[PDB]
Structures are given as C-alpha cells and as structure tokens.
Design a protein around this motif. Sequence first.
Motif, PDB file in Angstrom:
ATOM      1  N   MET A 268      43.284  42.990  48.210  1.00 26.96           N
ATOM      2  CA  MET A 268      43.057  44.416  48.401  1.00 26.96           C
ATOM      3  C   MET A 268      41.793  44.718  49.192  1.00 26.96           C
ATOM      4  SD  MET A 268      45.477  46.427  46.813  1.00 26.96           S
ATOM      5  CE  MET A 268      46.420  45.612  48.101  1.00 26.96           C
TER       6      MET A 268
ATOM      7  N   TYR B 277      38.795  46.477  53.690  1.00 29.86           N
ATOM      8  CA  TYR B 277      39.995  46.834  52.953  1.00 29.86           C
ATOM      9  C   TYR B 277      41.224  46.258  53.641  1.00 29.86           C
ATOM     10  CZ  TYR B 277      36.740  50.309  51.099  1.00 29.86           C
ATOM     11  OH  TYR B 277      35.648  50.931  50.539  1.00 29.86           O
TER      12      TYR B 277
ATOM     13  N   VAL C 148      41.828  53.574  49.685  1.00 32.22           N
ATOM     14  CA  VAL C 148      41.016  52.729  48.817  1.00 32.22           C
ATOM     15  C   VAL C 148      39.545  52.997  49.095  1.00 32.22           C
ATOM     16  CG1 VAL C 148      40.220  50.364  48.509  1.00 32.22           C
ATOM     17  CG2 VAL C 148      42.652  50.901  48.304  1.00 32.22           C
TER      18      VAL C 148
ATOM     19  N   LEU D  36      36.632  50.182  41.805  1.00 33.15           N
ATOM     20  CA  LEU D  36      37.730  50.300  42.757  1.00 33.15           C
ATOM     21  C   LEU D  36      38.470  51.601  42.476  1.00 33.15           C
ATOM     22  CD1 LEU D  36      39.916  49.214  44.818  1.00 33.15           C
ATOM     23  CD2 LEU D  36      40.937  48.029  42.861  1.00 33.15           C
TER      24      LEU D  36
ATOM     25  N   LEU E 235      41.637  53.893  43.708  1.00 33.84           N
ATOM     26  CA  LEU E 235      42.868  53.987  44.477  1.00 33.84           C
ATOM     27  C   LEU E 235      43.425  55.394  44.328  1.00 33.84           C
ATOM     28  CD1 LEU E 235      45.012  52.958  46.283  1.00 33.84           C
ATOM     29  CD2 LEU E 235      46.025  51.657  44.402  1.00 33.84           C
TER      30      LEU E 235
ATOM     31  N   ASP F 148      52.427  50.549  43.552  1.00 31.23           N
ATOM     32  CA  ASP F 148      51.085  50.179  43.124  1.00 31.23           C
ATOM     33  C   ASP F 148      51.027  49.722  41.673  1.00 31.23           C
ATOM     34  OD1 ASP F 148      49.389  50.838  45.551  1.00 31.23           O
ATOM     35  OD2 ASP F 148      50.341  52.787  45.222  1.00 31.23           O
TER      36      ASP F 148
END
Lengths: 52, 216, 230, 45
Positions: free
Chosen positions: C48, C60, C68, C81, C83, C90
């Motif tokens: 990721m 990324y 992200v 992190l 998202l 996902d």
Amino acid sequence: RGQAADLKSTQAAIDQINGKLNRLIGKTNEKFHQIEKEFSEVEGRIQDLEKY
Amino acid sequence: EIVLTQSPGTLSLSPGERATLSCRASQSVTNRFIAWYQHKPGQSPRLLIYGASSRATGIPDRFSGRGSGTDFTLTISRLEPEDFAVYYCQQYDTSPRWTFGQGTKLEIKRTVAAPSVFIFPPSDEQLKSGTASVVCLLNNFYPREAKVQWKVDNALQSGNSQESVTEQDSKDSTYSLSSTLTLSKADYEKHKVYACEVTHQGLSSPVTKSFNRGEC
Amino acid sequence: QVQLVQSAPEVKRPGASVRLSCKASGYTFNTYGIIWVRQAPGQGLEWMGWISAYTGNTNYAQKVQGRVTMTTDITTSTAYLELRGLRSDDTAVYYCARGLLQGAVILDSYHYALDFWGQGTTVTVSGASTKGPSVFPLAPSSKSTSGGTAALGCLVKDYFPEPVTVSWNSGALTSGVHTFPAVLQSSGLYSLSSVVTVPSSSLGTQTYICNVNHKPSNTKVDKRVEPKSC
Amino acid sequence: NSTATLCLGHHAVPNGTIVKTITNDQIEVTNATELVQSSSTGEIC
Ligand SMILES: *[C@@H]1O[C@H](CO)[C@@H](O)[C@H](O)[C@H]1NC(C)=O
C-alpha cells in the motif's frame, strides 16, 4: 547557544549514497568453465596465447 | 512494474523431504533485494530469508535461499510440521515500492483418504422463514480436490450453491468440505428428490447421497 | 524486544474514511520506516505505502494514490494510515511491518526488507446492518447415517459481521468438531456451518447442543440438535 | 495594483521514459532514445 540537525537533507544525501552502493555491491558475475592459467610444463604456442 | 511469478503454485510433499520453491522475475534485479517471507494461516507473516541467501535471526538453518538475476529459489530440508504454510517473494524499487508474489501453498502430507459423505435436509423452521438450505458434507478426505454436483429430481442445478473448505486438520492432515444449496420454499416444494454427487480420487465410483422431500 | 502493536478491528460503511494505528516499541522509532501491506480475502499480500519517521516522505501505491494519507508521530512512535472512499474490495487484513533504515548508509539487506510484523487489523466494509445469527439444526440422518458414524451439525446463517464463536455442549465435545470458514452470500450476510461426528449408539444417550456467540450483535443462541422422528 | 510577479519554469510531459543516473536507478525524463538495436528484419541485403 543550541544545536539541532536537519533530518531531510541528511537522509537525501544518504539515499543517493545507498543507491550507488546498491549498484556496486549487489551484482554477481556467474562463470563456470574457463581456461587454465597455471601451467605445469612449457608448451610453447598455446601457452603464450591463453596467458596473454 | 517488476511483476514476480511463483512456481509451483501448490506443492504436496511428505514430511522429511526437500522442497524447492521458485520465484521468477520479469526483469533482472540485484541479489540485494528479493527476500522471502512465510505466512501461516491466521498468523502474521514472518521473514525467513533476507537479501538473497542470508538467513534471518531465529530461522532454522534447514531453510536456505539462493539465486540470481531472473531466477530465485528457496530450499527447505528435513521438512517438519512447523514448516507447512504459504510462502511469498518480494523485492524493492529505488523509490520505495514492494511488489509481492502470487503465493505458493505447501499443502502437504499424503495418504489418499476416501471422503465420508452425508446430506442434511432443510429444517422446518427455516422453511417457515421462506428460505431453504440443503447441506452436503464431505468429511476426512484427502486430497483437497473434490467435485460435488447437485441433482434435483435428476436435474443438474448450476449457480445456486456455494462451497466452503476447512484447512489441514492437525491430527490426520485431512480436509472437510461443505456444499450449501440455497433455494426458495416454493422451489423446494416443487420437487421431491434431492441429491448430491461426490467424485473423488479415493472413490472409484462417484458416491451420491439423496433424500426425498417430506419423507424421513 | 522489538515489537509492533496495531489497532483494533473495524467495521465501516461504503464511502466512509478509516484510520489505522501502528505502534513501535524497543527499537528507536525515527531510524526505520513503517510499511503497510494488506491481504484481501483469498488474495496475496498487496503493498500500500511507506512512511518514514526520519523524513516526512511518503510513497503510495498507484491504485490508491488519491485516497491514501499516511502520517507519523514521534511521540509516541505511532504511524497512522487513513483510507478514504472505502470500497468493497478494500475489505482486507492490514499489516504494518518495519521498513528501511532511514538513518545511515545501508550494506546489510536486513534493513532493505520487512522484518518485524504487527498482528494485523481486519477492516470489513459493507453497507449491511449489523445482524444477529439465526441457528437452524442439521439433524442426524435416518438409517443411522452409517454403521457406526453419526453426523450432526448446526447451520449459522444470515449474520453480519464476523466473527462468530461456536462451541459444542459448552466445550465438552472437542473431538471431530469442524467449523467451516464463512462464505459471503449474495445478500451480503455471512453464512457458516459447523458439524461434528459422534458414535451412532450415543445418539440416544447424549443430548447435543451447539452454542453460538455473536459479540457485535450481543446475541447468543443455543440450539438443541436431535434426530427427527416420524 | 502596484507590484507584479515573474516566475521562471521548465517544461514537462505526461509521458516520459526512465533513465539511470549513477545515483538513482529510476529517474524520469521527457524524451529519450535507445542505443541498442534489438530487432532484425530477418533478411540479408
Ligand atoms: C508512452 O510512450 C511509449 C513510447 O512510445 C508508448 O509505448 C506508450 O504507449 C506511451 N503511453 C504510456 C501510458 O506509457
């Protein structure tokens, strides 16, 4: 008086050095069967060529 | 990007045999990168071999790594029960980037075993709800390759079933499979014969288990 | 020792944003980066992004470049992190392994690889409402089902989201118990089946009851399994 | 009103190839040409 360090510039230069090092140390040259450079006797012609 | 392809995708091998796992690189990469990782089911992935051949701390010496350019291999000797897992292979791009591998599964241990097949008809309460589920169970069978076909009044049914398989059982190294047929109550009542047919390597002749609707 | 402790399991609605935490203990945090890799259900590990503790630099993956955002906190060694715009694909288990040494020149390939891994956090993204399971018995078949082997089970159906814990006769029965992995139905609610094999003679002697716990719904259902008689 | 500004810039392209300086294995460039011929017609002149 005080002292502090700039992290970003240090790591940028270190990254350049790291890439250089990676391009040199990692490579491996694979070679199996070759000529002989150690000669027991004197053979004349063929010895001179392969030694050269 | 630098896509990595892992050879053989699934390998079966009795305990105490050497094993070779292959990772093939789309483009040539220095031996500095391309490390080898282990993933055990339900557990966080572990690092086995870093660099190309170096052994990570705490990793048994039986594990060895080797390779150059396009081809890289992982060799395991004196295979013990701790070793059975999925294995992955990865490398690095100058701007930090880590392309991984598809996954080689070391499903192993042998002794072909015949499946035990049972069939479970839908309960009446579930029928009250309006949805019917017929369950066909295969127990203690090896290898993991099995085919189940659903027959309703001697009619093949496709697209109305789902399947679920357990991992290797530690005690006997056998698998178990469950096939669920989902139907409406009216469709369930429209037919009287329900069967599941199992074809397996252990079974020379396919084994079919059946029940008749409204008949116990 | 060097140790990495991740965040907690999370459930999210499609289109929302999720934040995940990774904490480092033992090793000096600023020297190594934190690298996030995820495993989708029935899928290989997928990189990721990478965050540095020394520098603020981030890289990324192309598939998630826009959505992200990754951050670091020196106090106290915490990597985040985030998202955004979550999609059904996902749904995965997200890991946070230790990354490259961002403090000095590098000759050992140990720092150029991911070494110490966290436990991982499961993020499930789906629009389904949280729902308790419904338990329907799988009855022992007639004709003894076999000469000496009898099969009985419980069907756990229409539950969201995972996990469910299934025990038989309050833990008395641990032999022959098989709990199959859940399957995602078309409706979006997970379904599971648990079966066990018992001697045919013992069917009359012992009553078999399956216990099902679903902590997210706070629902616990116990159903008796008995052979149907007519 | 008074006070203006002058900026100084360089060009770029959506599509560019990759080259290898000594330090960086991957650096993008606008346009480049390969120095190694690798395709042959299969005929002799
Ligand atoms: C960019 O240029 C190369 C060289 O002609 C071409 O092959 C490629 O299709 C172009 N587009 C992309 C997205 O790389």
